[PDB]
Structures are given as C-alpha cells and as structure tokens.
Amino acid sequence: HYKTNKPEKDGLFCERIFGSRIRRYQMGYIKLACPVTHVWYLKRLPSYIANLLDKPLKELEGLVYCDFSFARPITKKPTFLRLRGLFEYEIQSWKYSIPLFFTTQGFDTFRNREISTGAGAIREQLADLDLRIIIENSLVEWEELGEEGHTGNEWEDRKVGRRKDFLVRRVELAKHFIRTNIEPEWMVLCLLPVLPPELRPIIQIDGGKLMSSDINELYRRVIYRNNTLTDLLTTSRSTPGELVMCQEKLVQEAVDTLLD
Amino acid sequence: NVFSPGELIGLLRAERMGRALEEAICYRVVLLGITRASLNTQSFISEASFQETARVLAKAALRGRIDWLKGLKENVVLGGVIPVGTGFKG
Amino acid sequence: EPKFRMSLAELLDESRVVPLSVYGDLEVGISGVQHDSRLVESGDLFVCCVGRKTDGHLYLSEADKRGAVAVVASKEIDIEETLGCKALVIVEDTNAVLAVLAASFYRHPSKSMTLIGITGTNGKTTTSYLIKAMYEAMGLRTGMLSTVGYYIYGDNKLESPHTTPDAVLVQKLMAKMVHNGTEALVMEASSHGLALGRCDKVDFDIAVFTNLTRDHLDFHGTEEEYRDAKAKLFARMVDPARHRKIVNIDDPNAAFFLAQGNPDVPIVTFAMENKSADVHPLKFQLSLFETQVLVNTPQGILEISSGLLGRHNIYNILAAVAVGIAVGAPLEDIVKGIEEVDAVPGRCELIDEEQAFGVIVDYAHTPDALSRLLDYVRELGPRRVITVFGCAGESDRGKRPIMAKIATDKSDVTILTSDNPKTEDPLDILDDMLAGVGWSMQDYLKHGENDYYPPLPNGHRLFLHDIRRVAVRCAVAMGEEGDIVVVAGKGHETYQIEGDKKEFFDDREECREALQYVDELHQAGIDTSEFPWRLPE
Numbered sequence: 001h002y003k004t005n006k007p008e009k010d011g012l013f014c015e016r017i018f019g020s021r022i023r024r025y026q027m028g029y030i031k032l033a034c035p036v037t038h039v040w041y042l043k044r045l046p047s048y049i050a051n052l053l054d055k056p057l058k059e060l061e062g063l064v065y066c067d068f069s070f071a072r073p074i075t076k077k078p079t080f081l082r083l084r085g086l087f088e089y090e091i092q093s094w095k096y097s098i099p100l101f102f103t104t105q106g107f108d109t110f111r112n113r114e115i116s117t118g119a120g121a122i123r124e125q126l127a128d129l130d131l132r133i134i135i136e137n138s139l140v141e142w143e144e145l146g147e148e149g150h151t152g153n154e155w156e157d158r159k160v161g162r163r164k165d166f167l168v169r170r171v172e173l174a175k176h177f178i179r180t181n182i183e184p185e186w187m188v189l190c191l192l193p194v195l196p197p198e199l200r201p202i203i204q205i206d207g208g209k210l211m212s213s214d215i216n217e218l219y220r221r222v223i224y225r226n227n228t229l230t231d232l233l234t235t236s237r238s239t240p241g242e243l244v245m246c247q248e249k250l251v252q253e254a255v256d257t258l259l260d
Numbered sequence: 261n262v263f264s265p266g267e268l269i270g271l272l273r274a275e276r277m278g279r280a281l282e283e284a285i286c287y288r289v290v291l292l293g294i295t296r297a298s299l300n301t302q303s304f305i306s307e308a309s310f311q312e313t314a315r316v317l318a319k320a321a322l323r324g325r326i327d328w329l330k331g332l333k334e335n336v337v338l339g340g341v342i343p344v345g346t347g348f349k350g
Numbered sequence: 351e352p353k354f355r356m357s358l359a360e361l362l363d364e365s366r367v368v369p370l371s372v373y374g375d376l377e378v379g380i381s382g383v384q385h386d387s388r389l390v391e392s393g394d395l396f397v398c399c400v401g402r403k404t405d406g407h408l409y410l411s412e413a414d415k416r417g418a419v420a421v422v423a424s425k426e427i428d429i430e431e432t433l434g435c436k437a438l439v440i441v442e443d444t445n446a447v448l449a450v451l452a453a454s455f456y457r458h459p460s461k462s463m464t465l466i467g468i469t470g471t472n473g474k475t476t477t478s479y480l481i482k483a484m485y486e487a488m489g490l491r492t493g494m495l496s497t498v499g500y501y502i503y504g505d506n507k508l509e510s511p512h513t514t515p516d517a518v519l520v521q522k523l524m525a526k527m528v529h530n531g532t533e534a535l536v537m538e539a540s541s542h543g544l545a546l547g548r549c550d551k552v553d554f555d556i557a558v559f560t561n562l563t564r565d566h567l568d569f570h571g572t573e574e575e576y577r578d579a580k581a582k583l584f585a586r587m588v589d590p591a592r593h594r595k596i597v598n599i600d601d602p603n604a605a606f607f608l609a610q611g612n613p614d615v616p617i618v619t620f621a622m623e624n625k626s627a628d629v630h631p632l633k634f635q636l637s638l639f640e641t642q643v644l645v646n647t648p649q650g651i652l653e654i655s656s657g658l659l660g661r662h663n664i665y666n667i668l669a670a671v672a673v674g675i676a677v678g679a680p681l682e683d684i685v686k687g688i689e690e691v692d693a694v695p696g697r698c699e700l701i702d703e704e705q706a707f708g709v710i711v712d713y714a715h716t717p718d719a720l721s722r723l724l725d726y727v728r729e730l731g732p733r734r735v736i737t738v739f740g741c742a743g744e745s746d747r748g749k750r751p752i753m754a755k756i757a758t759d760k761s762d763v764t765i766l767t768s769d770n771p772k773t774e775d776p777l778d779i780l781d782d783m784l785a786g787v788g789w790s791m792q793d794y795l796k797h798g799e800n801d802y803y804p805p806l807p808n809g810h811r812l813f814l815h816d817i818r819r820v821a822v823r824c825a826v827a828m829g830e831e832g833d834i835v836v837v838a839g840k841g842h843e844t845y846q847i848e849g850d851k852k853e854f855f856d857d858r859e860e861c862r863e864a865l866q867y868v869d870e871l872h873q874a875g876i877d878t879s880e881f882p883w884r885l886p887e
Contacts (some may be wrong), residue, residue, distance in 0.1 A: 040318050048322060077777070079798060080824060082882035092887040094874045101867045103860065132816045168265050173322075174868050180324040 005205040012212070012219060013197045024198035029190055032094075032221060033230040035119040036252045037064060039259040050183060051170045052134075053125060059087040062123055063250070068243055073116045074124040081114045093257060099156045118248060119188050127185040131174050138171050194219070218258040225251040268300055306333035351529055353382025353522035355455035356395075364844045367397070367450035369441035377516035378419040378435035382522030385451035387412035389519035393434035397518070398422035398447035400547065406444035409497055422447040423769050451518035456525035458873035460502070461553035461587070464492055464534035466673070469544045472668045472719070476698065477560045478538050480655065480670035480691045485534065487675040492529070492534035492600065495520070497543075498696070498842050503527035503535035503656030512666035534649040541565035541576035550579060556594040556676075562603035562671050575675030577607040585611035592616075596672035598665065599624045616676075618649065620668045629668055636660055638701045638708040638730065638834055640692055645671060645708030652679035655691035657848045658710065660729050662722075667691060671769050693874040698723075699858070708834030709826060711858055712810060713841025714739070717749060720838060727836050734833035738765035738825040740818070741776025741783060750779060754786035758810055761826070765881075767821045771840045772847045776816055787812060801882060813881040818846065819855065826864040827871060837861070848873040 017028055029037050034129060042057075042064070050057050062068035069091070071083040090116050099107040116124060150156070177184055201213045212220070222223055232239065261268065262281065275285050292300075301307040304320040304327055330333055332342050340349040355361045362383070380394035387409060390396035396418035398406035409422035415434055421429035422441035429438040440704035443449040450666035465483070468478040473494050482494035492503060499507035500515040501527055502524035524535035539549035545566055559579060565576040584593055593615035597604035608617055629650050631643040640656035643664065650671045655661025670691070674684040694700040701708035710727065714720040722738075727735055737757060741750045757764050767782050768776050781791045786805060794814065805811050815821035816862055822837065829835045839856075840846075846853050868878070877884035 004640075032426075040314060044315070044318075046315065046319075059345070075795065075799065078814050078881075080793065080820075080881050080883055081885060082813065083885055084801065084803060093885055094876065097263050097870055097874045098876070099863070102820050102823045103863075103873055106817075106823075110817055110820055165266060172264055182324050 001208070003208045004211065005207055007178070012194075012200075012203060012216060018197050018241075020174050020198075021052050023111060024196055027196050028194035029191055030226065032189065032251070032255075033233055034248045034251065035123050035188045035190050036218065036255045037119050037122060037188045037190075043256075048173060049126070049187060051166065051173055053089060054112075054170075055086070059132045060122065062087060064116065064119060065249060067117060069115060069117055070121055070125075073121045074113055074128055076128050076139055079113055083114065117245070119252065123188045123190075124183055126187065131177050131184075135171055135174050138167050138174070142171075144233055179250065189255065192222075215258070218254070222251060222254045222258055227256055303327045303329075303334055305329075306337050307331060312321050351526055353380075353453060353456050353525050354529070355381050355453040356383045356444035356522075361453060361455075361658070362395070362450065365450045365454045367441070368437075369439040369447070371426075372437075372765055373430075374437040376420065376439070377437060382417070382525070384449050384516055384518045385409070385448045386516035387416045387418065388417050389516040390416065391846070392417035393419050393632070394412060395420035395439075396422075396815070398441055398444045400444035400448045401515070406441075406447070409444075410440070410647050417735045438461075446594065446717050448517065449548070452521035453525070456521050457552070459528040460521060460524040460535035463503075463528050464845060465538055465553060465555040466488065466492070466494065466536040466538060467544070467549050467552075467554045467557045467577060467580070467583075468494075468538050469549070469557075471541065471565050471620070472561045472722070473662050474540055474560045476666040476691075476695070477539060477670045477673075479695060480666065480687050481673040482536070483668065483690035484674035484684060484687040485536070485677065487683050490534050491532050492536045493532065494536055494538045495778075496538070496556075497540055500674075502537060503532035509859055512575055513638065514539050514546055514548035517548050520548065521552070541580070542569070544553060544583065545570055545576045545579045550583040550586075552583075554584055555589070556673065557581075557584035558596040558669070558673070559593045559604055559607060560595055560597070560605060560666060562601040564603075573723055574603050577603045581607040581610040582846065584615075588612040590614040594618065594673060594676060596620050596669055598669075599627055608696075610796065620665070620672055621669060622664070624847075629671075631664065632725065636730065638710070640700075643667070647671075649675055651675050651684045653681055653684065653688060655688035657685075657691065658694065658698050659726050659742035660727060663698060699841070702858075702862060704828070704862065704865060706814060706827035706868070707831065708860075709861050709865065710834055710836045712838045713843070714838035715742075717752050717756060720753060723836075723838060724757065724760055727834070731834055732832040733830050734763070734873035735761045736763055736765075736825055736833060736835045737761050737828055738767060738768040738822055738837055739781045740769030741772035741841040743772040747782065750782045753788035754783040758806065758812060759808075761810065763811040763813065765821050765825050766812070767839070768816060768848075769818070770847055771849055773849055780814060780816070784812075784814065803880070803882065811880075816823055819860065822860065823864040824878065824881070824883075826861050827868045828880070 001008050007015055007019070014242065018026055037059060042060070047057055049160070059068060068087045068089065069085070070087070071085045072079050145164060146160065174186065202211050218235055226248065229251055232244060232247065262277070262283065263285065268290070269287070274285070278285055295311065298307060299311065299316070304316055304325055308316040328332070329338065332344060335342050357379045359377065360792070362376050368582045368618050376395055378393050381396060381659070382392035383395050385397045385399040387396055390413060396413035399409040400406065407423045407425065410421035410429065413421040414427060414429040416434055417436035418429065420438040421427045422439060424442045427438070427440050428438040434480070462484070466481055468481065470472050470477070478494045478496060482492060485492045488624065493501040493505065495501045495508070497513035499733065500510035500520060501507035502520050504527045508523065520537060524537065528535045528800070537549050537554070542565070543549055549815070558721055559577065559580065562577055563575045567835040568574055570576065588611060591614065595608040595615060595617040597608065597619065599605065599619040600623050621627040622630055629645060629647045631644065631654070632646050633644040637644045639660070641658070641660070641663065642656050643654035643656045645652060645668070651674060654671065655667040657667050670687060674687050697713055699711040701710065712723050715721045724735070724737070739757070741753070742851070754766070766780060768780060777791065784791055784794065789812070823837055825837070844854050844857055846856050871878065875886050
C-alpha cells in the first residue's frame with residue numbers, strides 16, 4: 001500500500017498465502033486462463049515437442065505465436081470435418097455459416113476437436129499421443145529409409161543422415177515416456193508457480209518503499225495481463241478473436257520471458 | 261532393442277556386451293575432451309550442471325533421472341558429509 | 351372444485367366403504383379421496399391402493415407419512431400419529447378400498463357422460479386421438495388419456511410421471527372436468543394400464559382394441575392377459591348395442607376378446623384384406639406427406655384419414671373410422687378427425703410442411719418395434735433409408751447389438767449416437783453398437799485419419815458421432831429429395847439425460863432449423879453427401 005508500508009492483500013508479498021522462516025518457505029500459485037508453453041522446451045535447438053509431433057518447427061511456432069490452424073489436433077472422437085490441412089496461413093472457410101447452422105452453443109461443444117488454436121491445441125495434441133505405435137512407425141520408417149540406395153551430392157546424404165538422426169532421437173525420447181511415469185502433456189504450463197518472498201529481494205517496507213526487482217515486475221506484468229485476460233473472457237464471449245488472441249500471445253510471451 | 265545408433269557407452273561395457281551378445285554391435289573409439297567428457301556423467305546436480313545449467317536440467321527432468329550421490333561436489337551442493345576421508349565409511 | 355362427495359363420512363358410507371374398524375368419522379375436509387399416497391394431499395383420507403409393486407400396508411404407511419388423515423391397511427395402522435386429523439379407518443380389503451377411493455358422484459359423472467377405452471399393442475395412441483377428435487367434431491367435448499400425458503377429460507392434459515395415473519385421481523379429475531369445462535370424461539389406457547387396474551375401475555361405454563397381440567407377457571406371466579382383463583372390464587359395465595368391438599380380424603386375440611362379454615354388444619371388424627369386414631383402401635395415394643384412401647364400406651365412412659405410415663397408420667385410420675361412423679353416419683363429420691390424424695402427431699410423425707427432404711420422427715426403442723418401423727419405412731422410402739439412433743445407459747446390453755444389426759441390415763446409411771448417456775461413459779455403448787457389424791471403434795478411428803471410410807460388406811454405409819445435435823443436423827442435411835430421414839431415437843420425448851444432468855434439447859424445431867439452413871449450407875458450397883464433409887480449403 002502506498003504511504004502505508006503494509007503488505008496489500010492478494011499481492012506478491014501478501015499474507016496468509018506467503019507469510020519468519022515459514023514465509024521464506026511458503027509459495028504461491030497463479031491460475032492461467034490460457035495455457036502457455038515452457039521456454040526451453042520449444043525455442044531451443046533441441047525441440048522435444050517437435051521431435052514428438054513429427055512436424056517441423058515452423059508451423060508449431062506459428063500456432064504458438066501467430067494464428068495458424070490444425071486440421072484435427074485431438075484424434076479421439078469421430079470427426080466429420082474433412083480439412084486435411086497441416087497449417088492454414090489464412091481462414092477461407094465459412095466460419096459464420098457453419099457455426100450458425102447447427103445451434104448456438106452447439107458449435108462450441110465440437111469445435112475444439114477440429115478447430116483448435118493456441119497452446120491448448122499443442123496440449124491436446126501431446127495428451128492423446130499413442131507412444132507405442134509411434135515407435136513402431138518410426139522404426140519401420142528407419143528400416144525403409146536408407147535401403148533404396150539413391151546417391152547424389154552432399155546435400156542428399158547429409159539430409160538423409162539428419163533425418164535418420166532425428167528419427168533415432170525421436171525413438172529414444174518416446175521409449176522413455178513409456179516407463180518413466182512422466183506424462184508428455186506437462187510441458188505446457190496450465191499453472192505457474194510463484195517464488196517465495198524472501199528468496200526474492202525484499203529487505204523491508206518503510207513509508208511505501210518497494211524493494212521489487214526485475215523478476216518482481218515481470219510477475220506483476222504477467223498477473224496484470226492474466227487478470228485482464230480473464231476479465232475480458234468473463235465480460236463478453238462475442239468479442240473479436242483478434243484482440244483476445246493478441247492478448248493471449250502477450251501473456252504467453254510475458255510468461256516466456258519470465259521463465260527465461 | 262539394446263542400443264541406439266547414436267550413443268556414448270563405456271569401453272568395458274561395450275566389450276562385455278560384444279562378448280555376450282551376438283547381435284551386430286559396431287563401436288569406434290571416440291576421444292572426448294576436458295569439457296565434453298564432463299558433460300556426460302552419471303550425475304546431473306554438480307558434474308553436469310556447471311557449464312550449461314539449462315539443457316542438462318531440461319533433459320534430466322524429461323528423462324526423470326535418478327541420481328545416486330556417489331560424488332563429492334554433489335554432496336557439497338547438498339550439504340551432507342562428503343564420502344572422502346573421515347566421511348568414507350565401511 | 352377438484353372433486354365432490356368426498357368430504358363427508360356419509361359419502362364414504364354410501365360408497366360401500368366398509369373397513370370394519372373406524373375411529374369417529376371422516377369429518378376432515380377432502381375434495382377427492384385418492385388411493386395413492388402421492389395423489390392424496392395433507393388432511394385428506396387415503397384409501398388402500400391394490401398393486402403388485404405397492405401393497406395395502408405400504409400404501410397406508412406412505413399415506414401416513416405424507417400426512418393423509420385416514421390410512422387403510424389389513425393390520426392396525428397408526429395414521430393419526432403424523433396426520434392432520436386423528437380420525438382414520440383401516441380397511442382389510444385393498445381392492446375394495448381402491449374401488450371406494452373414488453367418490454360415488456365422481457365415478458357416476460364420468461360413467462354417465464361417456465367413455466372410450468383403447469388398449470392396443472401397436473398404434474393405440476394414434477387411434478385414441480383420432481377417436482377423441484371424432485367425438486369432438488360430433489359435438490361432445492371429451493378427452494383421451496395417453497401414456498405420455500394423463501387426460502381424463504378436456505383438451506388439456508395434466509403432467510403425470512407414470513404412463514397410467516392413479517384411478518382415484520383420474521376419477522377426481524374427470525369429475526372436476528365434467529362439473530365445468532367438459533361434457534364427456536373418457537378414460538383411455540393401454541394394455542398395461544388396463545391390466546394394472548387404471549381403466550378397469552371405470553364404466554367403459556366403448557372398449558375396442560386397435561391391435562391385439564401378446565402384451566405384458568413378461569409382467570403378467572401369461573399371454574392374452576391384457577386382452578382378457580379388457581374383456582372382463584368391458585363385460586362388467588356393458589350396454590346393448592353400445593359397446594364397439596372394432597378390431598383387426600387377423601389378430602386371434604381380438605377375436606378371443608370379442609368372444610367374451612355380453613353378446614348383445616355391437617361387433618365389427620376393421621380389417622382391410624378380410625371381405626367380411628367390408629373395409630378396403632381401394633386407392634393408391636400413399637405418400638410421406640398425405641396418404642388418402644377411398645374406403646368403400648357400408649358402415650364405414652367414404653373418405654379416410656391421411657396417415658404417415660403405410661399399414662400402421664392406415665390400420666389406425668380404419669379403426670377410427672368405425673368409432674367416427676358409430677356416432678354419425680354422415681362422412682362429413684369425419685373431416686375434423688381426418689385433419690387431426692394428418693396433423694402429424696408426436697408418434698410416427700410425418701414429414702415437415704416445408705419444401706425439403708422428408709423427416710420422420712418415430713419412437714422406437716424395443717428391437718421388434720424398431721424392426722417393424724424400419725420395414726414400414728423401407729416400404730415407404732422411395733430411394734434411401736437414413737436413420738440415426740442411440741442406446742440408453744444401464745439398459746439391456748444384449749439389445750444394442752441386435753438393434754444395430756436390424757438397423758444395418760435394411761438401411762443404406764445409418765448414424766449411431768448416444769441417445770441417453772445417463773451417467774454411463776460415452777464411446778462405450780457406441781462401441782457396443784459398433785461391435786454388432788463386427789467393427790471396433792479403433793478401426794473406424796484409424797480409418798478416419800484417412801479419407802476412404804470403407805463401406806460394409808453388404809454395400810451399406812455406417813456412420814457415428816458422439817454428440818447428438820450435430821449428428822442429427824447432419825443426418826437431416828445428408829438426404830436426397832425423394833429420400834426421407836428417420837429419427838427413431840426419440841419421439842414425443844423431450845429430455846436428454848447426458849450424465850447426471852438432463853437437457854431438453856431434442857425436438858422437431860431443430861430439424862426445421864436444419865432444413866431451413868441447409869439451403870444456406872448448399873449455397874456456401876459445403877458438401878453433405880457423406881460424413882466427411884468436403885470443406886473448401
């Protein structure tokens with residue numbers, strides 16, 4: 001509180017959820033309206049998600065940052081929308097005619113099976129991944145590849161070696177998840193942890209003085225954007241998709257910078 | 261199903277597997293370096309998390325590695341008694 | 351004005367309500383005495399209810415718990431412990447108590463005004479409403495009770511949980527209607543309702559069966575039990591040349607029921623192929639919109655009603671023509687009945703009036719009824735037979751595969767959904783239905799990743815979807831001009847219990863909206879020929 005030197009309720013250095021060693025050991029948690037993805041699970045050169053999804057980094061980067069659409073990310077229920085589209089740069093479908101055809105609220109209950117945009121699409125794709133047939137298909141592709149004997153320049157065999165190395169790395173990554181009790185859909189952050197107050201730089205509060213550091217202001221920014229996002233979602237659902245998708249990107253990039 | 265095409269296995273383990281298994285196993289001696297050999301160890305706390313500290317933790321958390329505190333700097337970072345000298349029991 | 355002659359001890363004494371043990375008198379004010387505890391109210395005498403499920407002692411206990419003033423039972427019942435009036439009377443006879451529950455003046459008005467009972471195996475409610483419309487066109491206001499809603503008298507129908515309400519409550523409602531707002535109180539019940547004792551405890555002026563067959567064989571434990579009960583109820587109160595025995599001559603149970611009872615009652619047959627019945631269609635105008643026939647009979651009317659079904663609706667119209675001609679020999683009076691029969695009621699509904707593909711909403715849950723409706727649709731369906739249905743949770747597990755087999759045997763393209771999840775896991779009973787054709791959900795899902803969808807070995811096609819709304823809209827949109835879409839999942843029902851909660855999102859307005867928006871869908875360029883809609887780009 002300004003000019004009070006008192007911890008404001010439901011803040012960063014608040015009480016009863018953060019607060020003297022119990023205060024140094026207690027932590028907090030923030031719920032996120034939209035899922036986000038770990039910093040070093042994607043952008044880095046070793047892209048475990050890309051190795052598990054058999055798709056180059058370009059499209060997924062697009063789903064996460066830009067607006068691109070998958071044909072059917074989750075394949076567990078019978079689908080009737082034949083799209084066969086890996087990534088759509090623009091939307092050319094009759095989104096107004098198809099949604100208004102069946103019923104209001106009747107389009108929402110089935111749109112998530114085919115039309116999924118954002119980190120939630122990646123989460124749903126990683127969730128229902130059959131880790132026992134992936135290794136089979138990867139091994140049969142490794143056996144088929146390299147046996148035809150098609151020679152050429154260095155760009156040919158170098159690319160073949162890179163492909164088989166990616167395939168072997170995919171097999172090695174998939175064999176672990178079968179016997180490690182670690183589910184692959186945990187790479188996205190549906191909920192973000194909060195660092196304890198004493199671990200953060202905090203000496204004392206006197207006369208409205210705030211010892212917040214850069215990580216503290218990053219946390220303030222991300223919680224501000226998250227509560228604004230959830231307020232926008234709770235206010236009206238018929239708002240434009242552009243502004244809400246831009247804000248979701250904004251929170252995601254913010255939480256990514258915070259994790260980095 | 262035993263080993264992958266890209267792996268770094270020990271020399272004695274490779275020789276014993278060759279004497280044991282009949283499946284075609286081909287290995288070539290690789291000369292590691294001062295930095296490269298330290299990045300591939302049986303522990304991730306100290307001997308692996310000293311240079312990168314970013315991917316050595318990522319891959320360890322992805323694999324769910326179980327580290328047995330059989331080193332020195334591991335117990336130094338932990339805070340217990342180092343199993344060297346007076347701490348070495350048995 | 352809920353009832354009369356039920357708020358005095360002398361009224362119950364005149365009704366031959368002899369319980370052999372009473373305390374004081376029935377001084378408590380009660381509009382109408384109800385045998386059922388739920389039908390009775392607080393401070394009202396409740397007589398013992400005779401039934402296989404609830405006996406006299408259980409009925410008396412439930413009445414004393416609900417606050418009934420008097421409770422009748424074989425043994426001593428402490429009704430005055432939790433009642434508004436200390437006076438009570440325990441009747442050792444459950445049947446006599448259930449009969450005396452209805453007031454004398456209450457049972458007298460409904461028995462004197464009119465009565466029409468229709469207890470048939472198939473197509474009973476299709477003829478009950480037709481007979482009610484014929485009686486209304488004759489100039490006498492009356493109501494016909496159905497399994498969906500209990501309507502003793504009047505156009506409106508009160509909400510009732512069971513298919514057949516309490517006899518005492520039905521008599522009280524009929525008396526209240528006949529007192530003001532209704533000229534006739536006809537109590538119509540099905541075979542199960544007649545065998546239970548709902549319509550049996552009422553003087554029926556005309557007791558005809560629309561379709562006599564094996565009804566309540568598993569409940570009663572013997573064939574022709576409902577027909578025998580209906581014949582006994584008709585013989586209890588029968589008048590010369592007043593009771594009608596109009597029924598199909600092909601059914602032996604109909605002849606067996608007509609043989610019993612008073613022979614002075616008028617007998618007639620409504621069979622079309624039989625020459626003794628003298629009734630015959632003698633016309634070829636069958637269609638999904640209207641099927642008019644030129645009946646040529648001496649007693650029956652000339653014009654017939656437009657029925658949606660080929661033989662079932664025609665049989666119902668032929669059975670109702672007799673009841674319509676009994677009141678008035680002129681065929682002009684049956685015009686209102688024919689119009690009401692062509693109004694496309696909830697059961698075996700006809701196509702929509704809008705220029706679009708035919709839509710038939712039917713009520714088919716049992717395998718035999720589903721099979722006969724599918725056969726009638728195949729006989730009516732010119733080009734294609736498109737059907738969509740589902741199974742209910744915690745139901746007969748052996749019913750799903752035989753239903754799926756009977757559906758896929760005669761239908762070119764069928765959609766399988768979850769009609770009633772009711773806490774049962776989805777995609778589980780759906781896999782049970784898929785196992786009937788030998789397919790598994792895994793095979794169809796791995797084929798769905800491709801764009802082939804191989805058909806059945808017999809040449810037919812099979813589709814499925816989890817949600818009911820989208821699949822029903824697709825089935826309504828995936829139809830040819832001459833083809834008709836049949837929805838046998840639910841008919842007059844308007845409740846979908848998906849898990850613990852229930853949603854009332856099943857009606858014909860959704861089908862009308864889909865048939866209206868299919869024009870915009872086709873204008874947009876979407877392909878609705880098969881399940882994998884070809885979306886442009």
